[PDB]
């Protein structure tokens, strides 16, 4: 206590800062050539213990020269073309002709953001308050969770969803969840092991829109809510309780409640636990996750399911089922969580705009609870797998050492990594080049299934992000689908490849390698070399041309989605959503 | 980036740690200026100084100094003797200011001023001695960066050459002011070798002490006597002392008149040891110790006539005690000093005669490596020192010998064996015989068998004193009063030196070195000291009230090196570890 409060705070500040640094380095410093691995000519202001341990340098100096004559100095464990490194010192800043200084968290955040706002020519004070608000939540999170082993999040599936203490490791405000403050934060936060009874409404069956593959409409309904309380001619639907509050602000909803067309049944649904995506709920031993709309910003978008996404979910689920059934030999060993049921409600007499609004508000998706198959103690969300614990150390190190009974030598780490990366790259690249199916295989859409620590599967999830290429993938959907649903699913071959590149190498594998190679940066080139060899090998298996894979293998730059830059640039500035980072090889 | 900058930074950290040791032991602890507490206000202290990402980097230590000056540093342990590992840079704050981390020279200046204020006294040369000491350490680290950091522990002479940082609680451990002669040619830390300087002198001016050796054999131990003409002998000297010697008008006269002959650097090629003016020759029966008119740590390292005489008497006493009373000596291992030589003109007046004798003074020390083995014998100061990477060298030394990382019990058992072999002989000699050794780190040599402590050899008869109530009775009534005076300590003076040397200078450093990364082992080690003291007391043949009081947990005398140098040897008291 008290000492625990300062400590939790300092831990949250270091973690939040490291995420902000990640963004600065990946999105600005590297692509625009502001970064040098050099010592400042003058060090005044920087204390000897920042960079010298008594025998040797604490890693490699990193200097970033920014506008307004601002320079940043920090010590790092490695040079890395993707901006993946461990920071071995406090951040020092020097302004024009002043000395090096070490600012407190808020002033440091302010100055770094101001620098990026200068490069952008645009300020975003909302983002600034979100960075601070995210850090404050993380402080409460660390303070709440200082009880267990630092690697406890890796021991059970739900604990792995709950134990992403720090969130997206390269986002400026990973924990900012933008719903009315009076609704509270901790009540909804997997990081506080949140549980709640889902909110329920009773609605007339004539406004239901049910999508179902290998289930009856009634089984889809049952998957969300027990239908017993429903009167004849009605069904029960469920909703995030925050969403239900948002939903009921609307005049159209107020009118239906007043006219007794729908009934508000309160928080009377299944008691369930939010996962890391906040609006998807886990129930131990239920056949399904419940994914609902939440019309709120979390990281870089509003977490609502648009009507055409509710429609597209059904088609994509149907597609994956046919691919796994008839085309297993061109899917690279794909393991994916199905999304067999979708529900939404709108009043039957509603015009199109109101119908669409109602369907987005009430939209729900059933995802196969894979833990029934894979086992709760064998399944770990990959973001948490490659994350830092409450002690700010990669949790994977002790997880593996426990499972392997001993300290893993270089070979054991390389071998583990090889098993991990093949299971990720093969299904994704096979889907993309053979069938034009664009997954979004970032860390949160990926779940490691393991056997005594050893990788068996990388299960992939989230159909709502899945796209189909103009040249290959889009052929797989009917001619008679709504034009808007088609538009929703359609990506160019190039759009698809940019997303796959970022998700696979920068978001996912780069974090994999950084976590595994902590204390041993020399392993990173070797791991990336194994990736390059794996790509060459997958290319051999492919049934369709893969010129994109040629260029990547040949060392051409890799697309990197921005998380900070997008929030500074105009919404109309499409270019700011990506940058290019040098290849790990060449 | 450079090894030059790294070396400077290593030397500055070493030098500063040594200075903190003095501040904490000599001032902060006995005067109650020390608190293990966090400052209410941390502004200026960066997070990384005290916080590693998960926890605090040890324990905060605060010291309140004069004129509203405060010092902050993180340490690995609370320690009543002031023995801790420093885990952060030092931060200073004065008056209405923020915490600040000054460069080395500004830091030394501010800390020295504070100590000048607490002490009242000022030594104008000290500041420059501190800096010159740090600069030499920088050159030393720079030169010695190719070896395994624990190389100094592999061979006796390497242990003597490998005390890179010197006395660990001294403001200027490596301060040496040579008359245009260079540091490196005389520096053990640069593996220096030189032929000794030699003079042919007439035998009528010789003063030779000899025990178990003839006067001629003593002569032979210093120098091959073949080149000497009839009625003459060859003596040797430090080459630097030889140059200083010959700058004297009295000496130039004798040379001009051909009474003595300068034979140049024609003597034995030898290697200076850690003490600078004692030379080692592998394969020779003797070290050669000579006078040198240069200050090294606290003393100008020259030996006066009565000190030359007392060496002979002490050597004779140790032979008497071993011949007749070995069973009350506690397993004593000591390097004999069987020969002493000096020369002065036969005609000379007392004043001149004394000057010449001190100038030409020479002592033979038994080369114990002949019986203990060069690869088995390690000077204790180096054994418990930090290597060029500032890691305690004993950790890797022990690991290699035990074939594995030593667990807690292994360290504890090694320590127990070590401390018993130190404490027994020293306390037996003091209590049974009134003989006061000076068993500090440089006067002790571990003899080990595959790393297991066998004996702690003690040396340096010049340091040996005899108590007024017991030891001095071994001195015959026909001894010159000045020689008896040089030997005499009060029983209380004797005990304070023994206390300081055994527990604070020596075993505190032993424990600190062995227990890096494991501060919890310290009190356990200190508890074994206390148990061993009880055991030893039971063996004693004479009253030991002083030992009762020590076992009982009463304060321990600590010699003040910084104050000594500020003064240009008083004792403070430090709380018992038990
Ligand atoms: N490394 C990461 N990369 C991407 N998203 C991450 C990462 N770590 C945590 N997240 C979080 O996971 C969510 C990912 O968005 P995505 O659209 O893939 O999930 P969803 O559709 O909201 O939910 P589900 O995966 O349950 O369908 C976001 O809330 C994001 O903040
Ligand atoms: N921890 C230590 N305690 C005491 N002296 C030390 C220590 N470390 C290094 N020394 C050095 O060892 C010497 C100790 O002085 P002392 O008077 O015992 O030796 P000496 O008579 O000059 O030579 P010798 O020991 O060779 O006879 C000094 O040069 C001193 O700087
Ligand atoms: N006979 C006196 C000679 N003793 C020393 O010279 C030892 C010491 O005083 C150091 C010390 O005692 O800690 C020094 O100045 O290095
Ligand atoms: Mg997702
Ligand atoms: Mg000595």
Numbering used by the authors:
A (entry chain A): 3 to 588
B (entry chain B): 4 to 182, 184 to 572, 578 to 587
Provide text from the study.
The first NIS synthetase to be structurally characterized was the achromobactin biosynthesis protein D (AcsD), from the plant pathogen Dickeya dadantii (formally known as Pectobacterium chrysanthemi). AcsD catalyses the enantioselective desymmetrization of citric acid via adenylation of its pro-R carboxyl group with ATP. The resulting enzyme-bound homochiral citryl adenylate reacts with l-serine to generate the first committed intermediate, (3′S)-O-citryl-l-serine, in achromobactin biosynthesis. Structural and biochemical studies have characterized the first step of the reaction in detail. These showed that AcsD is a new member of the adenylating enzyme superfamily, with no sequence or structural homology to other members of the family.
However, growing crystals of AcsD pre-incubated with ATP, Mg2+, and ethylenediamine showed clear additional electron density for a molecule larger than citric acid in one subunit as well as density for ATP and Mg2+. We interpret this density as (3′S)-N-citryl-ethylenediamine (CEDA) and were able to refine the co-complex. ATP, Mg2+, the protein, and much of the citryl moiety of CEDA are in the same positions they have been previously observed to occupy in other co-complexes. The difference in position between the citryl moiety of CEDA and citrate in the previously reported citrate/adenosine/sulfate complex occurs in the regions occupied by the carboxamide group in CEDA (this work) and the pro-R carboxyl group of citrate (previous structure). The carboxamide group adopts a rotamer different from that of the citrate carboxyl group. If the carboxamide group did not do this, the ethylenediamine moiety would clash with the α-phosphate of ATP (and AMP). The ethylenediamine moiety of CEDA sits in a shallow cleft and makes several contacts with the protein. There is a particularly striking bidentate hydrogen bond interaction between both nitrogen atoms of CEDA and the two oxygen atoms of the side chain of E442. The side chains of R501 and K563 point towards the ethylenediamine moiety. Structural data show that AcsD uses E442 to achieve this recognition by making a striking bidentate interaction with CEDA.
